[PDB]
């Protein structure tokens, strides 16, 4: 049994594809897409937007267990991610693509999610990359919020206003789980897939991919 895409890579499987990982000291399984042919491989994808349109306006439980198809657009699952990132140290790499043919990335030396009891509050440290000199995810990491679980710091309901599950602040500079907009409908959308630091607020990205890997 493998707990992540690195373990899978270090055991011989060095080819891109969906793999079956299993929760830590558990019997429960979960399928994640493994990026093995880039950056050295061993990358476990925790979310992807490319467009195979999955609808990310999902419930707390769906964000907890994950949804979508591992070969297309999906969300791995907060519970699984929380257990992995609290086991050992992991980096988080956020890859983005716009509609003009550009791609940039943000990398965090350390990333982890608190337990569900603390609403899967995100924790980020050590930012580098070309998608911002400052994190597009509010520092002082926020609790995770969904349409049926308001845990942002807004009087408002960020998840309902922007759509999807995210670590919204008073909503904040990002939401990669927002509504997908086609080209020429990607400008001025406080409802789309945004990553402020790179394309400013309003621009809705064409594709995104969030992946993690330890210090391997």
Binding residues: 150, 152, 154, 156
Write down how long the chain is: 216
H-only helix segments in 45-147:
60-65, 78-87
User: DSSP secondary structure string, 159-184?
Assistant: HHHH-S-B--SSS-SEETTS----TT
Nearer to Ca ion, 127 or 171 (CB): 171
* Cβ atoms of residues 208 and 194 within 8 Å: no
Q: How far apart are CA 70 and CA 48, in angstroms?
A: 9
Stretch that binds Ca ion, among 101-109, 145-153, 168-176, 189-197 (CB under 5 A): 145-153
CB atoms within 10 A of CB 207: 18
Give residue 178's Cα distance to chain centre. 12
Q: What is the DSSP letter of 206?
A: S
> Among residue numbers 151 through 170, which ones bind Ca ion (CB under 5 A)?
152, 154
If the CB atoms of residues 7 and 148 are measured against Ca ion, the closer one turns out to be 148
Find out whether 144 and 153 touch, Cβ atoms under 8 Å: no
State the minimum distance, in angstroms, from the CB of residue 122 to Ca ion.
16
Binding map of Ca ion across residues 96-135, x = CB under 5 A, - = no contact: ----------------------------------------
List the binding residues for Ca(2+): 150, 152, 154, 156
- Name the minimum Å distance from CB 155 to Ca ion: 6
Residue 197 Cβ vs Ca ion, minimum distance, rounded to whole Å? 23
Cβ proximity to Ca ion: between 106 and 175 the closer is 175
| CB of 156 vs Ca ion, minimal distance in Å | 6
Shortest Å, Cβ 177 to Ca ion: 17
How many residues in the shown chain lie near Ca ion by CB under 5 A?
A: 3
Applying CB under 5 A, among 150, 179, 189, 214 the residue interacting with Ca ion is: 150
- The three-class DSSP label of residue 155 is coil
C-alpha 194/C-alpha 77 separation (Å) is 20
Closest to Ca ion by CB, 125 vs 157, is: 157
Coil/strand/helix, residue 116:
helix
Asked if 7 is part of the footprint of Ca ion (rule: CB under 5 A), the reply reads no
Residues that bind Ca ion (CB under 5 A): 150, 152, 154
């Amino acid at each position: 049994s493998f707990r992540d895409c690195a373990e899978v890579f270090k055991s011989g499987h060095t080819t891109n594809g969906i793999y079956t990982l299993t929760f830590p000291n558990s019997t429960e399984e979960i399928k994640a897409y493994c990026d093995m042919e880039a950056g050295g491989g061993g990358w476990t994808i925790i979310q992807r937007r490319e467009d195979g349109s999955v609808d990310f306006q999902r419930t707390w439980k769906e964000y907890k267990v994950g949804f979508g198809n591992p070969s297309g657009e999906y969300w791995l699952g907060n519970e699984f991610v929380s257990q992995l990132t609290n086991q050992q140290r992991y980096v988080l790499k956020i890859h983005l693509k716009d509609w003009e043919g550009n791609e940039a990335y943000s990398l965090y030396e350390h990333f982890y999610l608190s337990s569900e009891e603390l609403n899967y509050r995100i924790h980020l440290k050590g930012l580098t990359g070309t998608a911002g000199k400052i994190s597009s995810i509010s520092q002082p990491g926020n609790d995770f919020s969904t349409k049926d679980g308001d845990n942002d710091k807004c009087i408002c309901k960020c998840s309902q206003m922007l759509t999807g599950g995210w670590w919204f602040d008073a909503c904040g500079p990002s939401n990669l789980n927002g509504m997908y907009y086609p080209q020429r409908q990607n400008t001025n959308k406080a409802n789309g897939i945004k990553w402020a630091a790179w394309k400013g607020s309003g621009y809705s990205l064409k594709a995104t991919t969030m992946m993690i890997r330890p210090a391997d």
